Each structure stands twice: as structure tokens, then as C-alpha cells.
RNA sequence: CAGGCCUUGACAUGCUAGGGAACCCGGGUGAAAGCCUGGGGUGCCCCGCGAGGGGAGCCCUAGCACAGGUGCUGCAUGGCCGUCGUCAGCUCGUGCCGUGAGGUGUUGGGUUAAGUCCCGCAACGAGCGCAACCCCCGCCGUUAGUUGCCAGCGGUUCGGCCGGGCACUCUAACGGGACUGCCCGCGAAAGCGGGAGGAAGGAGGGGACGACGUCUGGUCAGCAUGGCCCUUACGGCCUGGGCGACACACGUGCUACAAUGCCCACUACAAAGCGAUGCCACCCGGCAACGGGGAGCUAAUCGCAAAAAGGUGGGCCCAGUUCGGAUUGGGGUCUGCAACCCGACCCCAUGAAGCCGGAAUCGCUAGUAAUCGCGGAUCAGCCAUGCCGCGGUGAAUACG
């Protein structure tokens, strides 16, 4: 019925269900275009659908929790690049060579005692 | 990079035209990280390359880059006890950064009301031979060659 | 004025604003951690000896 | 609802498989070990006695919560778990 | 609602103005508010070192005690 | 100053706490306030005996008051005499059900705080201090040791110029977490000032 | 901005409400 | 610091003479302190019906032996921290060269972040140091489900609400995994370039850890500590002041000088934590601060709580301005005995400088800088723009 992909990228959680068909997209109970309005990074995690030509092989149901607007986006990018290699384990071809797999450990750093914002050191004489 | 060659990062394409040089101008239009505001101002002004002088927002940008990219520059070096500005060919990577940057500066300084309004205008005029970044490109270039007296004072 | 002082924190006087956190093994007035009852340098040397119940040195 | 509090987890996770293992042998039917998000209290301290704000250090208080439920209660269940193996540093809780 | 005057001074005050208006009440209460009975007297208020007297008038009724005998000595710089 | 306390480093890496119990917001300071109170009575009138650590446990008015020690008799006496009048003086302030305990130290020449307050007592005794550090270290390797390290700090012998005396035969890799090293500190107050004394016994890996 | 109390940005930075930022 | 008090003292141990004890309430005064003073009446081990007693808690007075001192000395100190410096060092053992200081090793050729390893060698070993084991993060699993969940069905008053379920998400414990281990390239070896598979490769990101030592570094004011010195005062209590003074001088910072902006409506998406004489849901009253009423939580289930930016679409139109929030006047609230000196929060009005800064200088290499909001501690309240954290948007560049 579905195809499932676990997505995260920097304190974000994006649960995807590549339920086949037309290509309509809902996250958290609304069209992808309603939620993600304004955003130009918002077109998007539907790009893994552009690495296996399947804009017209899948509608989408997604749940998402954490981080922010464009930080959630990169989660569904791991959530749509995983829900396609699950459907066709022969589709990681043109997915990891196209770099849509993996999961970026690019996390915001612990603020350091002394440096005003992790590294932005105090001004001295 | 006393040690290494200092890694050159590739950029993303831009979802709208899939161009790694369109992300490179929008990053230099950026301010305070607010990239969502950085991106409108292109397509706000790309629309201004389309409304005014009906053409190709893809191609007026890519010309305005080659119309501000400086092939010869001069950096000052210390010899004897002298401050000689050395004639050198500015590398292609230096060019990109050099082209885009003057392009934001010259545009920001413009006497027009909205940000993109300037951005477009400048891009148009750069390809047309007459911009603010276009003066600056010739300034550096003829600042060089005026200084070819220091050509073997080049590394 | 110091010891007769630490006595003065032990005896609540004329008002309820007028009380403060002095200290126990320290006679220390400032940087008093009330959860621990300990005065920043009281706290730290006993945290290293381990005389503080399950109080780890962090690292993350 | 046998809400097991504590500081040390390795001592706390030996007795929450103890009232897990032993009530199952003594009734039914033991909710397996559930781990609550540990509530952390930190202490950042100027290492030196005097001034030296530039140099400090980090100490934390990890008090990890643990809940466990008894499904079909029974007698002998609260008398097998009336007298329980300690340890010196674990907190109990009884409900239903 | 709320107005504060110590009440060791307003005790004398409503005992002094009552029992024959004199003046010259010395006190260590600049925290008090100069209630309108104090009008026309002489309170010697303590700024810390000195008991500066004040001749109480109408021109300052809802006013406090310690503004009226300042603690610091200025005169100038140079 | 630039070094970390080799113990507080290992509190859950090698060694372990000495009030190993649980509490929270309501009552944390008061059982802990008691602990130091316990340690004041027990570090005084349990000196001339040994005493290297105090492991303390709590329940619900059950404070366990366990002593590590070099010589147990000086806690219990004869028949059971002292360990009971110690379980009469302590269970007064502690307000609860005490339990004054004893566990004998397998060679007090591998216990470091023992290695310490011995060698520092030898400072207030006005001995060859230098030769004592070479001595007390020497003894500890002589009785099963992978390494040791002692440091004496202050008016060494009394001399006005404040020195730092130092000795360490055998490996002590303080930078390691699985290093197991016992450490203690001895405070020799003298005819002329206070001398610092340290202790560092590499006991083996883990 | 964040120092002009009599507005929205002024209360927020500050940690306050009233008219120009209410609850 | 000023004024007013107390002398064995605010605190400790002990001995001695008289009371006598505990303990609770006044009276008078005084700014408070303190001073003087009117009540009740002690279990107990006790000859004892008794008069009455012995002794002992706890108290007073007197008199000591003493206290107390943030007074001086951080070159008489401990301890702890700062610092060079995460820098790649600094040493021993024996052997050997040298009359000796000392050297040799540790130097040299090759390579790492590194005394990183490899090879050479009158050297061969060895320690403290780097690394490793520890934490955090990033991939996957086991264990576990009152936090998640139409992913699954039914019902859904339509709030995951009920059932119902652990697959998820999440939680938090134990595990797995990277090893230049596999190939290609070169190299005597180590090792470098490049490839694949891989969630991540070449210390994957950060933390913690910082050598013998140096700076007669810093703290006697956290604490202790040798000594000097003060013992109706250098002790101590108290009321009030000062620590917040202002002709000026420098450091760290906050908010700006606007339109990539401000303003107003409305609409989304975090994380870390903290919550009982606490967090305060929700109504009512107030332009509001707040003020009532009042529900729930020992807290992954109640609460702080709003994130902000952003997005939508309207206001402003280049104006010292709807830029910027200083200053002052007035009316207010809350904490608190008490906001004159000296508190924050609110409402109205006043709306100064400032149109981006001379000479000079600081920070930062990737999720960093920039920008944005949130917590916490200490704290009644608060002068936090500080500090310690948390995450949101997210770059620039590196020939050398």
C-alpha cells in the first residue's frame, strides 16, 4: 500500500509514506504547497522523486516534527530517498551516486565556556 | 591552509534554474542568513529583467557575470623598500567571487527604491557595457597593464 | 566582620527579605547553590572527592 | 505503575528487571522496563577560588526516571515484592 | 490604597501638633512619607552623618522624608 | 595549577562516590549536610587508627555510616566497646538509625590516603622529608604496585623559600580513564606553616 | 526596534506584555 | 562611614561564687540596638504522706583560662585556578665519548596533528607527555512501551478522542560499526594520492583530558595556614548612609542611524530546561502592569509556553522620519517592613544623539561567522544588555 522512509537532518523528524499514484503531497494534514509556502528550499525532498523519474508514480503522506522549516525539508530528503530504495532496492543506483541517501551530521555546536557563541571569541586588548 | 590547498566547496544548483552560479549570487545577496528573503530578490528582479527589456532572466545574469569578471588584477607586494602593485591574471575562481561581489555592491548603492529593482537594473546594464561593477572591472584591469613594469615581479 | 556574621544568617531577624544564603563548611556569602547548600568552591572540591551523591563531571 | 527513580542507572537497571523478573514468576504479567527522559540539573562553576571567569567546568545531576506496570495484580505479588532486593541507591514507587 | 509613614514619628507628630505645636523632632526615618499633618514644623532628618532639619510647607506634601536632606556633598569638580 | 583531580575524573569511569545514595529538590542539602557532619566526627576520633574512605548509604531514615580503615579495633575496642559508643555519638545528630561499620584495608601501603597522611605525619615529626618521599613511594612498589607518585609542597624542612619536593618511580598515566589510581591528600601543619602532601598509586588497568 | 518599548519588538526582547504586545 | 549601644561578648570549651534553672507574655523607653522591668513555673535519680531536700538538664550574674579580627604579610603557605599551551615536548637507567660542565639517546634521511610511526645510527631500553579507554552527536539493531500511532480497522461528540495496536516517532540503557581493513597508484619500510562498498571514512563533528615547568603569575577576601599586630576595640549589635558620588579617561557590551527597514493584523515550524506557602490552565475586571476568582501537576501524561525570524497582505515612501528610544513630566501596578537616596514592570506625553564613524583595533574556516528567539542558575523583587546553555534561518573565502 505504502512505501516508507525515515528522515532526519539536524534535530528534525520526517516520516514519509510513498503511497503510489498521481503525485499530490500532504505533510501534517495539508498540501506540501500550503505548509511550505514562501520557501524556495521547499522544492525539495520531492527532488529524490526527480532522481528516479517518479513524480508520477507516487502521491505522498508525511508526518514531521522538529527543527524548523527548511531543516524539516532535508529530513524528507532522507525520507524520500529511502522510501524509493525500499520500493526498488535497485534504485539506490542513481540515488547514492546522486547523493540523496546518507544523513548529514551537520549539527549546531555546543556553546563553549569563554567563547560568546561556541567560537565568537571575546574582544581583547 | 599553510598545509593544505583549502577545499573548494561546490554549491547546490538552484531549484528554479538548476544553476550553481545562481546560488552563488543569491548567497552574496544574502544578509544575516535570511536566504528566503535573498531568493525572492532574484526572481523579484529576474521578473524585472523580463518585464523591462523582454528577454531571458537566465541569460542576462550569466552575461552580467562575464561582463564584470576581471582577467588582470594588481595586488601590492614589498620589494627593496617599495610598495609595487603587481600585475597578475586573476584566476577563474577568484573571478566568480569577484564578479558576483561587485555586482551586489554596485547594485545596493543604486538610487532605486526596492532592492531587487536595483539588482535587475545592474545585471541588465552589465551585459550592456555600462554598470557600476563594470567601471570597477576596468578600473582594476587598466590599473594593471599601467603596471606591466612589474610583470616579472609576479610569482 | 565574619564569624559573628555567619551566626547572623542562622538567626532570622526582623524581616523575611533580610534572610540570605550564607554557607556551611564555607562561611561564604556569594555563589551559594541552595540545592547543594554549597558555595561554588565548597561545591567543586567535594564534587571531585565524590562526597556529592551522583554528581558527575559532564562532557558532551 | 511501579515508578522507579534513582541516580545510578546500572544499579537502577538491575532492580527494574528484578521487580520485572520476579512479579512475572509471582502473578502476571509485568510491563517491561520503560525509561523516562532523564531530568538533568547542571552546575557550571568558576574553577578557581577568585577571579578567572575565563576558566570554569561542567558538572551534571542525572536523575533517570523508570516506570513499570503490573497487569494482573494478585496476592503473593505484593508479598514477593513486599520484601525486595535493594540497592543502597534506588527509589521506589507503588500504585495501580 | 497604600501610603507608608513609619508610625513612630506620626505618633509623636499627632502627639506634638496635638499637645501644643512645637517642632525639632529628631528621627532616623527618611523612608516615611511626609503626611499632611507634618505641615509647618521642623523635622531633623538623618542623611547618614548629619541631622539636616526641614521646615515643612504645603509646597511639598505627598513627598518623602529623605529627598529633603541629601546624603552626598558635591560643591564641584575642579 | 593546570591538573585535574585524578579521582573526580574517574567517578564512574574507575572509582566511585562516597555518599552513594538518592534524593531531590525537597531534601538534598540536609542528608548531605549530615554527611559532612558524619565525616567531622569520624575523621577526628578515628584518626589514630587509619581510615582511607567513608562509603555512606541512605534509605528512609537508615544511614549506613561505613568506614574503610587500616586498623579496626580502634573503631570497636574490646568485646565490641567502641563501635557501639560510636554508634551512640553518631546516631544522636544523624537523628536516624545509624550502623557504624568496619572493613579491613588489605595492605594500607596501597591505599593512597594512607600512603599520604603517613608520609606527611613524618613532616610534622620533622624527619628527612626528601628521604621520606623516596621512602613511602619505595615501600608501595615493594608491596605490589604498577606505579606510584608523591609530591610535597611548602616550607620543606622549614626553609623560608617555598619549594616543591617530588618523586615517582613507576608508571602513572593520569591522562587515562581506565588507569585505576588511588589518590589522597595529607595536610602536615608544622612549627612553621602548612605543607601539602599528595598520593598517586597506579594499581593497574581495567 | 528592540529598545522601543512602545511596540511589538520592544516588549519581546524585554520579556513583557501590555498593549503593544498583550496576552 | 556617621550616629546610638554591649562587654566575656554574635560563636566555642572548661572551672570556679550567688542565684537558679528551662521556657512563654508583657510594661516603660529608644531610630533601632540596647537599657530598666511586672507574670507563670521544670520533668527528675531522689529520705519522702510533710516541712523540705539531694542531683541533673536549660538559664542568669559575677570572675577567669580565653574568644573574636574581611587587620598586615599570596615573596613565611596549603589548596585551587590563570598562563605559555593541545604547543611536542621534558627526563631517567645502564653503555659509550669527554679532565669537566655535559654530550650521546632525543640527532639525521622519510611521515603524521604529535618524540605519529618507518629506517638509519654508540647506543639499547624505560617514564611523564600525544594518542587509546570516558562522554555528546551522526547510521543500524536488541530490550522495553499510558510519550508515538487511520502506519491498521472500527467507532471518532471528530481533541489520537475511545477501543485497538509497538510498526513508527520519541524515550533511555546495552550493543553493532571504520580497521588505510579492500583495490588502484608510489614508496625500503611507515606512509600519501585516488577508487568501491559504506550512515559516516582516513582524529566524522565537538567535549572532557592539558607534560617537566615558566611567569617571586593570582586568591590570607571562599577556606584553611607560619608570623606580625588589635583584645570596653582593628571585637560585636544596631539605626542611617556609602558600595549607585561626576568636571573626565579607557575596556566589554546593548540598541541604533533604516526600505534586504519599521509598523499592524493573521498564519506556521524548535530545542533545553525549570516548575508546592511553585508552574499558575480558564474565565471575569482593567488600554495595561496587574488584580480577582479558579482547574490541573510530586510531573515525557497538568504548567511555564509566546518561540522569534520566517509566510500571507495591508500600512509607511526616503522624511532625522510609522527610522532611532534617549530624556523628562504625570498617572499606575507588583515585590518588600521599607523603593528619598537607589527597584523592575505599565499607560499617556515628552520623542535627544545618531544619516554608519579619525588614528587605531577584535572575532571567526561550515553549520563556523552573521542574524533570530528560548531556558537556567543566583534571585522575595530587581537595576541580565552579564554569564552558562538550547535550538531556528544559514554564508564569505583560503594563490600562498
Q: Where do the domains of chain A lie? A: 1-125
Candidates B10, B16, B22, B36: best to mutate against A (most CBs of A within 10 A) is: B36
In a domain, F8, yes or no: no
CA-closest candidate to residue F34, choices F54, F49, F48: F54
The answer to whether A115 and A121 are in contact (CB under 8 A) is yes
What does each C-alpha distance from B43 to A103, B38, F203, G17 come to in angstroms? 31, 10, 70, 39
Q: Which nucleotide is nearest to F176 (CA to C1')?
A: H133
CA-closest candidate to residue A77, choices A56, A39, A48, A105: A48
CATH value at residue F184: 3.30.1140.32
Q: Which residues of D touch F22 (CB under 8 A)?
A: 5-7, 63, 89-91
The answer to whether A86 and A31 are in contact (CB under 8 A) is no
Experimental technique for the deposited model: X-ray
How far is residue B97's CA from residue B68's CA, in Å, rounded to a whole number? 11
Q: Which residues of F touch D91 (CB under 8 A)?
A: 22
The answer to whether F109 and F140 are in contact (CB under 8 A) is yes
CB of D47 within 8 Å of a chain A CB? The answer is: no
Three-class DSSP category at F195: strand
Burial of E36 (0-12, 13-18, 19+ CB in 10 A): exposed
Q: Which residues contact B133 (CB under 8 A, 6 or more apart)?
A: B68, B99, B102, B103, B105, B106, B107, B122, B126
Give the count of domains, chain C: 1
The answer to whether A13 and A66 are in contact (CB under 8 A) is yes
The answer to whether B103 and B95 are in contact (CB under 8 A) is no
Cell of B150: 612589474
Cβ neighbour number for residue D24 with a 10 Å cutoff: 15
Chain D: closest CA distance from residue C12 (Å): 28
How far is residue B35's CA from residue A42's CA, in Å, rounded to a whole number? 12
CB of D5 within 8 Å of a chain F CB? The answer is: yes
Q: Which residues contact D85 (CB under 8 A, 6 or more apart)?
A: D15, D18
CA-closest candidate to residue A84, choices A99, A67, A72, A101: A101
Resolution rounded to one decimal, in angstroms: 3.2
Q: Which residues of C touch F29 (CB under 8 A)?
A: 34-37
CA torsion angle for C25, C30, C35, C36 (degrees, to 10)?
-30
Domain E3-78 has CATH 2.60.40.1190: no
With cell 522496563, the residue in question is D33
The answer to whether C51 and F18 are in contact (CB under 8 A) is yes
**Could you tell me the distance in Å between the CA of residue B25 and the C1' of nucleotide H92?**
63
Burial of D22 (0-12, 13-18, 19+ CB in 10 A): middle
Asked whether the beta carbons of residue C53 and residue F32 sit closer than 8 angstroms, the reply is: yes
Q: F81 and F167 share a domain?
A: no
DSSP state of F129: H
Q: Which residues of D touch F59 (CB under 8 A)?
A: 88
**Could you tell me the distance in Å between the CA of residue B76 and the C1' of nucleotide H50?**
121
CA-closest candidate to residue F168, choices F144, F146, F195, F196: F146
Asked whether the beta carbons of residue F8 and residue C50 sit closer than 8 angstroms, the reply is: yes
F25: domain range? 16-106
Asked whether the beta carbons of residue B39 and residue A40 sit closer than 8 angstroms, the reply is: yes
**Could you tell me the distance in Å between the CA of residue C10 and the C1' of nucleotide H336?**
21
CB of F21 within 8 Å of a chain D CB? The answer is: yes
CA-closest candidate to residue E25, choices E40, E7, E39, E13: E13
Q: Last residue of some domain: F85, F106, F127?
A: F106
Q: Which nucleotide is nearest to F13 (CA to C1')?
A: H134
How far is residue B19's CA from residue B12's CA, in Å, rounded to a whole number? 8
Give the count of domains, chain B: 1
Candidates F4, F11, F33: best to mutate against C (most CBs of C within 10 A) is: F11
One DSSP character per residue, chain A reads ---EEEE-SSS--EEEE--BSS--EEETTEEHHHHT-S-SS-S-SSSGGGTTTGGGTB-EEEEE-SS-HHHHHHHHHHHHSSSHHHH-TT-STTTTTTT-SS----PPPPPPSSSTTTT-PPP--
Asked whether the beta carbons of residue D6 and residue F57 sit closer than 8 angstroms, the reply is: no
Cell of A18: 510513498
Three-class DSSP category at D10: helix
CATH value at residue B9: 1.10.455.10
Q: Which long-range contacts (CB under 8 A, 24 or more apart) does A29-32 make?
A: A32/A60
**Could you tell me the distance in Å between the CA of residue G3 and the C1' of nucleotide H254?**
9
Q: F140 and F180 share a domain?
A: yes
CA-based nearest residue in chain A for residue D46: A113
How far is residue D7's CA from residue D67's CA, in Å, rounded to a whole number? 14
CA torsion angle for F13, F19, F21, F23 (degrees, to 10)?
-110
Which H or E element spans position B48?
helix B35-51
CA-closest candidate to residue F127, choices F176, F78, F188, F179: F188
Q: Which nucleotide is nearest to F173 (CA to C1')?
A: H128
Q: F113 and F171 share a domain?
A: yes
Q: Which nucleotides of H are covered by protein (CB under 7 A)?
A: 1-3, 9-11, 31-33, 68-71, 75-85, 113, 126-140, 143-152, 168-174, 197-200, 204-214, 217-219, 221-226, 235-242, 245-247, 251-257, 259-265, 268-276, 287-290, 299-300, 306-312, 317-318, 323-326, 333-334, 336-341, 345-348, 351, 361-375, 377-380, 385, 387-400
CA-closest candidate to residue A71, choices A7, A6, A5, A9: A9
CB of C57 within 8 Å of a chain F CB? The answer is: yes
With cell 544523513, the residue in question is A103
How far is residue B144's CA from residue C12's CA, in Å, rounded to a whole number? 82
Q: Which residues contact F83 (CB under 8 A, 6 or more apart)?
A: F75, F76, F77, F100, F102
How far is residue E8's CA from residue D5's CA, in Å, rounded to a whole number? 56
What does each C-alpha distance from D35 to D12, D94, F111, F132 come to in angstroms? 11, 17, 38, 53
CA torsion angle for F175, F181, F186, F192 (degrees, to 10)?
-40
Q: Which residues contact D50 (CB under 8 A, 6 or more apart)?
A: none
Q: Which residues contact C26 (CB under 8 A, 6 or more apart)?
A: C38, C39, C41, C42
How far is residue A80's CA from residue A87's CA, in Å, rounded to a whole number? 11
Three-class DSSP category at D59: strand
How far is residue F136's CA from residue F116's CA, in Å, rounded to a whole number? 8
In a domain, F155, yes or no: yes
SS3 content of chain B, % helix, strand, coil (to 5): 55, 10, 35
Q: Which residues contact B108 (CB under 8 A, 6 or more apart)?
A: B115, B118
How far is residue D3's CA from residue D5's CA, in Å, rounded to a whole number? 6
User: Which alpha helices (H) appear in G1-23, and where do they start and end?
Assistant: 8-14
- Count how many Cα atoms sit within 13 Å of the Cα of residue B75 in the half-sphere of its side chain: 6
**What stretches of chain F adopt beta strand conformation (E)?**
68-69, 103-104, 147-148, 150-153, 164-167, 181-183, 186-189, 194-197, 200-202
The annotated binding site of C for Zn(2+) is made up of: 23, 26, 39, 42
In a domain, F160, yes or no: yes
Helices B57-66 & B92-109 angle (0-180, nearest 10): 110
G1-23 burial, b at 16+ Cβ within 10 Å, e below that, comes to eeeeeeeeebbeeeeeeeeeeee
Cell of A71: 531543516
Q: Which residues contact B154 (CB under 8 A, 6 or more apart)?
A: B86, B87, B88
CB of D28 within 8 Å of a chain C CB? The answer is: no
How far is residue F186's CA from residue F117's CA, in Å, rounded to a whole number? 5
Extents of the domains making up chain E? 3-78
Give the count of domains, chain F: 2
B134: domain range? 1-155
**What stretches of chain B adopt beta strand conformation (E)?**
72-79, 82-89
Q: F102 and F114 share a domain?
A: no
Sheet holding A14-17, edge to edge: A4-7, A14-17, A60-64, A25-27, A30-31
How far is residue F75's CA from residue F58's CA, in Å, rounded to a whole number? 21
Three-class DSSP category at F117: helix
CATH value at residue C26: 4.10.830.10
Q: Which residues of C touch F28 (CB under 8 A)?
A: 35-36
Three-class DSSP category at B58: helix
What does each C-alpha distance from F80 to F75, F84, F86 come to in angstroms? 9, 7, 11
Cell of B72: 588582470
Asked whether the beta carbons of residue D88 and residue F64 sit closer than 8 angstroms, the reply is: yes
Three-class DSSP category at B106: helix
Domain A1-125 has CATH 3.40.50.720: no
Cell of E36: 499632611
First-to-last CA distance in chain D? Answer: 6
Phi, psi of C42 (to 5 degrees): -55, -60
Which H or E element spans position B117?
helix B115-127
Residue C39 bridge partners (DSSP): C32
The answer to whether B63 and B45 are in contact (CB under 8 A) is no
The full 3-state SS of chain E, as one line of letters, equals: CCCCCCCCHHHHHHHHCCCCCCCCCEECCCCCECCCCCCCCCEEEECCCCEEEECCCHHHCCCECHHHCCCCCCCCCC
**Which chains have 3 or more CB–CB distances shorter than 8 Å to chain G?**
none
Question: What Rg, from alpha-carbon coordinates, does chain E have?
Answer: 13
Q: Which residues contact E30 (CB under 8 A, 6 or more apart)?
A: E45, E46, E47, E64, E65, E66, E69
Phi, psi of E33 (to 5 degrees): -105, 125
Cell of B101: 561581489
The answer to whether B24 and B12 are in contact (CB under 8 A) is no
Cell of C13: 531577624
Amino acid at each position: 500500500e505504502q512505501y516508507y522512509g525515515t528522515g532526519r537532518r539536524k534535530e528534525a523528524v520526517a516520516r514519509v509514506f510513498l503511497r503510489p499514484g498521481n503525485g499530490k503531497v500532504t505533510v501534517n494534514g495539508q498540501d506540501f504547497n500550503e505548509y511550505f509556502q514562501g520557501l524556495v528550499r521547499a522544492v525539495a525532498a520531492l527532488e529524490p522523486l526527480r532522481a528516479v523519474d517518479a513524480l508520477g508514480r507516487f502521491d505522498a503522506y508525511i508526518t514531521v516534527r522538529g527543527g524548523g522549516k527548511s531543516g524539516q525539508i532535508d529530513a524528507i530528503k532522507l525520507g524520500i530517498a529511502r522510501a524509493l530504495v525500499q520500493y526498488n532496492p535497485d534504485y539506490r543506483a542513481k540515488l547514492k551516486p546522486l547523493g540523496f541517501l546518507t544523513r548529514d551530521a551537520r549539527v549546531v555546536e555546543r556553546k563553549k565556556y569563554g567563547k560568546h557563541k561556541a567560537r565568537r571569541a571575546p574582544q581583547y586588548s | 591552509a599553510r598545509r593544505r590547498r583549502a577545499e573548494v566547496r561546490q554549491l547546490q544548483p538552484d531549484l528554479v534554474y538548476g544553476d550553481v552560479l545562481v546560488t552563488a549570487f543569491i548567497n552574496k545577496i544574502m544578509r544575516d542568513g535570511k536566504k528566503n528573503l535573498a531568493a525572492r530578490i532574484f526572481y523579484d528582479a529576474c521578473k524585472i529583467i523580463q518585464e523591462k527589456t523582454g528577454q531571458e532572466p537566465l541569460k542576462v545574469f550569466k552575461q552580467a557575470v562575464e561582463n564584470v569578471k576581471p582577467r588582470m588584477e594588481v595586488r601590492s607586494r614589498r620589494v627593496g623598500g617599495a610598495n609595487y602593485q603587481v600585475p597578475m591574471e586573476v584566476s577563474p575562481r577568484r573571478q566568480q567571487s569577484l564578479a558576483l561581489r561587485w555586482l551586489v555592491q554596485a547594485a545596493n548603492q543604486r538610487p532605486e527604491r526596492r532592492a531587487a529593482v536595483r539588482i535587475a537594473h545592474e545585471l541588465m546594464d552589465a551585459a550592456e557595457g555600462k554598470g557600476g561593477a563594470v567601471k570597477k572591472k576596468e578600473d582594476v584591469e587598466r590599473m594593471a597593464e599601467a603596471n606591466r613594469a612589474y610583470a616579472h615581479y609576479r610569482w | 566582620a565574619r564569624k559573628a556574621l555567619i551566626e547572623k544568617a542562622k538567626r532570622t531577624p526582623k524581616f523575611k527579605v533580610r534572610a540570605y544564603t550564607r554557607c556551611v563548611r564555607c562561611g561564604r556569602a556569594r555563589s551559594v547553590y541552595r540545592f547543594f547548600g554549597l558555595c561554588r568552591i565548597c561545591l567543586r572540591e567535594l564534587a571531585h572527592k565524590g562526597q556529592l551523591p551522583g554528581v558527575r563531571k559532564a562532557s558532551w | 505503575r511501579i515508578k522507579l527513580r534513582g541516580f545510578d542507572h546500572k544499579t537502577l537497571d538491575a532492580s527494574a528487571q528484578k521487580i520485572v523478573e520476579a512479579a512475572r514468576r509471582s502473578g502476571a504479567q509485568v510491563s517491561g522496563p520503560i525509561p523516562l527522559p532523564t531530568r538533568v540539573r547542571r552546575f557550571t562553576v568558576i574553577r578557581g577560588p577568585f577571579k578567572h571567569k575565563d576558566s570554569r567546568e561542567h558538572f551534571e545531576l542525572r536523575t533517570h526516571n523508570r516506570l513499570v506496570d503490573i497487569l494482573n495484580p494478585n496476592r503473593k505479588t505484593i508479598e514477593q515484592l513486599m520484601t525486595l532486593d535493594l540497592p543502597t541507591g534506588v527509589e521506589i514507587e507503588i500504585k495501580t | 490604597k497604600g501610603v507608608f509613614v513609619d508610625d513612630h514619628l506620626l505618633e509623636k507628630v499627632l502627639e506634638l501638633n496635638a499637645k501644643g505645636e512645637k517642632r525639632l523632632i529628631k528621627t532616623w526615618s527618611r523612608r516615611s512619607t511626609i503626611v499632611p499633618e507634618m505641615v509647618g514644623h521642623t523635622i531633623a532628618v538623618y542623611n547618614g552623618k548629619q541631622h539636616v532639619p526641614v521646615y515643612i510647607t504645603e509646597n511639598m506634601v505627598g513627598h518623602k522624608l529623605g529627598e529633603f536632606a541629601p546624603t552626598r556633598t558635591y560643591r564641584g569638580h575642579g | 595549577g593546570n591538573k585535574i583531580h585524578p579521582i573526580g575524573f574517574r567517578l564512574g569511569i574507575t572509582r566511585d562516590w562516597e555518599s552513594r545514595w538518592y534524593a531531590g529538590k525537597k531534601q538534598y542539602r540536609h542528608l548531605l549536610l549530615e554527611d559532612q557532619r558524619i565525616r567531622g566526627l569520624l575523621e577526628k576520633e578515628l584518626y589514630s587508627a587509619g581510615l582511607a574512605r567513608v562509603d555512606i548509604e541512605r534509605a528512609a531514615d537508615n544511614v549506613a555510616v561505613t568506614v574503610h580503615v587500616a586498623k579496626p579495633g580502634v573503631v570497636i575496642g574490646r568485646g565490641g566497646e567502641r563501635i557501639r559508643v560510636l554508634r551512640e555519638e553518631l546516631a544522636k545528630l544523624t537523628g536516624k538509625n545509624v550502623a557504624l561499620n568496619v572493613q579491613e584495608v588489605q595492605n594500607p601501603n596501597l591505599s593512597a590516603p594512607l600512603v599520604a597522611q603517613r608520609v606527611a605525619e613524618q613532616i610534622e615529626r620533622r624527619f628527612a622529608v626528601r628521604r621520606a618521599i623516596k621512602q613511602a613511594v619505595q615501600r608501595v612498589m615493594e608491596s605490589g604496585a604498577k606505579g606510584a607518585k608523591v609530591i610535597v609542597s611548602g616550607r620543606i624542612g622549614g626553609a623560608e623559600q617555598a619549594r616543591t619536593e617530588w618523586a615517582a618511580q613507576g608508571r602513572v598515566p593520569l591522562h587515562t580513564l581506565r588507569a585505576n589510581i588511588d589518590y589522597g591528600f595529607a595536610l602536615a601543619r608544622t612549627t612553621y606553616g602548612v605543607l601539602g602532601v599528595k598520593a598517586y598509586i597506579f594499581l593497574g588497568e581495567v | 526596534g528592540k529598545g522601543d518599548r512602545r511596540t511589538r519588538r520592544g516588549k519581546i526582547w524585554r520579556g513583557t506584555y501590555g498593549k503593544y504586545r498583550p496576552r
